[PDB]
């Protein structure tokens, strides 16, 4: 019925395929630190797979009325990102051995980031749709600031393998996460200049890269081993 069913279907496969690949790659691995990373990394694409699968079958999609139009809103993405993104943050947290104080702030910021994002995607007053977007973006920027400025300094005190792998995951996270608030802004959630079918394609390339590709880079590395 909806033309974006194919992109919902391509993500499902890759996220499902990456789920087992990480799950398979995680078998027999004895290192305790690695077991932590494999479990976290493997659960993320599994969480996304489940929501990509439900959307493909016509679940988690509502029609929010704003801007004079009935705008189709995929609210299932927020149940996905609510758990996948904090695990991506915890992955970096364990990677750089950050103290609990930083983590609570990162996890708190992510909840507000994804929390407000869903309200804006469902608010019926148009203007406030963008108000909530700003708060979320403000939250995201705080996260990227901690990762870019805080975490990096810690990664250098570590051994070289940890620093080299974190920089790649930092640049991948910074690049991909920064793209999420813009697509939301111009897409069906806000402006309505990019049709919903295209919005879906851009979120998939990011999610896959921000999970499968992100996970792939992490679990192919020797830094997860203590």
Swiss-Prot record:
The gene is bop. The chain crosses the membrane at residues 5-24, 39-57, 75-91, 103-122, 130-149, 168-186, 199-218. The covalent binding of retinal to the apoprotein, bacterioopsin, generates bacteriorhodopsin. This is Bacteriorhodopsin. It comes from Halobacterium salinarum (strain ATCC 700922 / JCM 11081 / NRC-1) (Halobacterium halobium). It comes from the Archaea. Light-driven proton pump. SUPFAM superfamilies: Family A G protein-coupled receptor-like. Keywords: Cell membrane, Chromophore, Hydrogen ion transport, Ion transport, Membrane, Photoreceptor protein, Pyrrolidone carboxylic acid, Receptor, Retinal protein, Sensory transduction, Transmembrane, Transmembrane helix, Transport. SMART domains: Bac_rhodopsin.
